Structures are given as structure tokens and as C-alpha cells.
Design an enzyme around this catalytic site. Structure first.
Site: not given
Ligand code: CL
Length: 306
Positions: A17, A127
Site C-alpha cells: 500500500g 501516532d
């Protein structure tokens, strides 16, 4: 040619991806397993080289994988690091999308320790999510210990020499994944150490409850959906999240939500807070985790589980 970085042969692919490609690999000098992070060279979001530097600054800290190589090869950029085990999100799924109180407490204090050491090296993570916390490998000494990978959103929050905090600003673009991001992040505010901690409290409730009340919300756009999620985070008191759960987890989320922007969090105070849960329930912090009982005691299986 099979080999990049002079010494790292490329094996099976473990992810594809936007992250270019991530592969399994082995060092052809000693056979140790590595993960090979490819990234297309000329691209609009160059991020790997700084992730390599971040690993080098955090080098040697327990729970952080080693960075073995970075360089150019073809039209790709490579970062070779220690290959590790599944994420906490993976083990969450295999454990029926719920961790028990003992596992959450033990996992939490290691996540508090990892994020603390990150803060000690003048960076905030920004994150926080269960997908970026990995266990070790079968037979390894750190097999069921929590690790922290992926530092593409790490930012310096204080000067490394003067130890002076970054200025507070607002109107910033929404950063991270909406399920775990802090309330200040929803409001477009500059993040700090407190936001890494608040996101952990969200993860802790996500492990304890199996879901968060702001999941599965609907909206015409993503901007409005992130606002609806941010709206319920402020509407839902910490005690309602902690329904039928040890109140220390609500106490934790409230205390880190109240931290000033530049305040240094009391990390050991939070760890002792969660540890007192085990004393209240007559449990010991011995290292036994839910996933170590999967499949009859074997552990996690590659094709049944995933
Ligand atoms: Cl919109």
C-alpha cells in the site's frame, strides 16, 4: 538482485500500500530476521530517511527496534530494521477483540514506559494506536514484550540542548487516526507529551471494552466525521467509559486530559496507578498475557488467526 543494503536479502512481503512495500528479510552475514521498508524515491510524501534518523536517536532504548541500514538502491529508499511480531491490534482480534484487565495493565505500563523514553529523547509520537505496538518473535527473550515501531509522525517538542518546549499554536490540520487521537488534536491544537498519553488512555479503554462509543459514527464527509468523533469524546465522561471497569483507568484518562501544554507528565505515578488495579483484584504482574493462551497454549497461528 535479491540483496539490498549489501547484507539484507529480501524474503516474503508483510505489507503493501502507501508504505511503499514492507518485506521480511534476513541478514546474510548472521541470519537474523529483518524487516525491509521500501519507499518510492521520487514521491510526494518522503518520510523514510527521517524515520531512520529517529531510530538512530532512540537507538539502544529497550522496546525500540534497531535500524541497521538506510541508503539508495534503484529508485527506492530502504530502511532495514529488526523484524518483530504481530501488533497489539492483531493479538486483540485473535483474543476475541478484548484484553482482560491483567493484560491491559501489563501492556499499559510498558506503553507508558516506551512513550516516556520517547519523550526523554525530545520527541512526541503523535501516532499512538495499537497497530504500531508489536510483540517480539517466538523463542526470543522479548517475545511477549511490547515494542514501538513507525515514527513517521514523530516531532521534536523541545530543544535537545536547552530543553525548552515548543510554542503553543492552534488551527493545525487533523493529525492521526480519529479513533485514538486526543481531544486537543480534534480541535486542531499543537500536540505535546500529554496528547501521546491521552491517546494511550483511549487505547486502554479500547482494549478493556472491545470498542469505543465514538466508533461506527456516520457523517457526509471525513471532516464532519472527525468532529462527531471529537464531540462524543468530550460528551462521554471518563467514568461512563469505565463502567464495570477499574476506576484507575478513568482516573488516568482524566489526569492526562488535564495536563498543561508544556507540563512533564508523572509517568511513574501513572504506572503505579494502573498497577494498583492488580492489587485490588488480587493479581500479580508476572507477564502472563492473553495471547499466550491462544490455540490450546501454543500461541498465535499464521493461517487460522490471521
Ligand atoms: Cl465537510
Amino acid at each position: 538482485s535479491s540483496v539490498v543494503g549489501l547484507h539484507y536479502k529480501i524474503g516474503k512481503k508483510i505489507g503493501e500500500g502507501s508504505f511503499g512495500v514492507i518485506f521480511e528479510g534476513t541478514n546474510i552475514i548472521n541470519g537474523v530476521p529483518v524487516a525491509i521498508k521500501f519507499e518510492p524515491r521520487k514521491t510526494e510524501a518522503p518520510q523514510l530517511r527521517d524515520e531512520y534518523r529517529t531510530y538512530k536517536h532512540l537507538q539502544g532504548c529497550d522496546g525500540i527496534p534497531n535500524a541497521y541500514y538506510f541508503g539508495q538502491e534503484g529508485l527506492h529508499n530502504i530502511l532495514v530494521i529488526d523484524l518483530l511480531g504481530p501488533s497489539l491490534e492483531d493479538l486483540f482480534d485473535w483474543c476475541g477483540r478484548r484484553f482482560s484487565v491483567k493484560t491491559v495493565v501489563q501492556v499499559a505500563i510498558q506503553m507508558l514506559t516506551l512513550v516516556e523514553e520517547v519523550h526523554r529523547h525530545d520527541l512526541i509520537y503523535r501516532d499512538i494506536k495499537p497497530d504500531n505496538f508489536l510483540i517480539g518473535r517466538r523463542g526470543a527473550t522479548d517475545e511477549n514484550n511490547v515494542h514501538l515501531i513507525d515514527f513517521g509522525m514523530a516531532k521534536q517538542y523541545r530543544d535537545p540542548r536547552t530543553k525548552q518546549h515548543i510554542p503553543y499554536r492552534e488551527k493545525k490540520s487533523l493529525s492521526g487516526t480519529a479513533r485514538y487521537m486526543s481531544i486537543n488534536t480534534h480541535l486542531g491544537r499543537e500536540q505535546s507529551r500529554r496528547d501521546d498519553l491521552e491517546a494511550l488512555g483511549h487505547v486502554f479503554f479500547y482494549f478493556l471494552r472491545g470498542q469505543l462509543p465514538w466508533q461506527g459514527l456516520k457523517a457526509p464527509t471525513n471532516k464532519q466525521k472527525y468532529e462527531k468523533i471529537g464531540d462524543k469524546k468530550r460528551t462521554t465522561p471518563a467514568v461512563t467509559l469505565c463502567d464495570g471497569l477499574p476506576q484507575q483507568f478513568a482516573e488516568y484518562l482524566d489526569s492526562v486530559r488535564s495536563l498543561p501544554f508544556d507540563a512533564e507528565p508523572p509517568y511513574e505515578e501513572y504506572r503505579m496507578l494502573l498497577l494498583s488495579v492488580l492489587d485490588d483484584l488480587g493479581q500479580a504482574c508476572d507477564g502472563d498475557m492473553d495471547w499466550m493462551h491462544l490455540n490450546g497454549g501454543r500461541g498465535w497461528d499464521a493461517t487460522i488467526n490471521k
